[PDB]
A = this chain, B = another copy of it.
Amino acid sequence: TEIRVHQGDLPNLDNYRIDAVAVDTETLGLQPHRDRLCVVQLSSGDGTADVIQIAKGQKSAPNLVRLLSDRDITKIFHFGRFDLAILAHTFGVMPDVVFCTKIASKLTRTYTDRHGLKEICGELLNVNISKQQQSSDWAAETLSRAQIEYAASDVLYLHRLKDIFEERLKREERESVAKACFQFLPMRANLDLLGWSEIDIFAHS
């Protein structure tokens, strides 16, 4: 495949005049207040991807942020609860038009309890993802070729998943539930950033 590697930001949005963009991030860990954003991966849904290295202390990425702020472009995530949190904490913009394949899976793949990306890709596309050591030093000044190819592999197939999940949501008549969940998802991410990350806010206890 084609993986374009950039420093700081996209040079322009010439490749992203599209209706939906696949988005994924890579960080130093699960705690946005401690673990900085290190890499952002994007795809137009074609056979190529862009991998943008974010520098320590970087506060702005205008072209990327333009994509994240544009309400006419749906941002596709897998477990967007996390990516939205870390992106908003880093760049100050919370996306508000999103689609999450994990929520969609929990709303459609009711016949399994395994909702990870590897399992979804295996069932829906017969594509074998080798998630061998996503645990690596993403803060390295120069990423290895294996790192870049693994990082890119996480976004090349989210569009196809979105198409299938939209078919499943239509088939089982769950469109309005999914729409409301996606509408609330950015506020779930905000609640995480504000300090309620360990609390199911709707639970009795």
Q: B-contacting residues of A (Cβ < 8 Å)? A: 27-29, 31, 33-35, 79, 81, 102-103, 106-107, 109-112, 114-115, 123, 133-139, 168, 171-172, 174, 176-177, 180-181, 183-185, 187-188, 190-191, 194-196, 199-205
Contacts and interface: CB of A to CB of B under 8 A. Distances in A.
A27 to B, nearest CB: 7
B190 A177 contact: yes
Nearest to A140: B171
A187 B195 contact: no
Contacts of A115: 205
A201 B181 contact: yes
Copies in the complex: 8
A29 to B, nearest CB: 4
A44 to B, nearest CB: 27
Nearest to A32: B195
Contacts of A205: 115
Contacts of A138: 111
Nearest to A100: B202
29 contacts: A27-B111, A28-B111, A29-B110, A31-B195, A33-B33, A33-B195, A34-B110, A34-B195, A35-B111, A79-B204, A106-B196, A106-B199, A107-B201, A111-B136, A111-B138, A115-B205, A123-B135, A123-B136, A123-B137, A139-B171, A177-B190, A177-B194, A180-B187, A184-B187, A185-B202, A188-B202, A200-B200, A200-B202, A200-B203
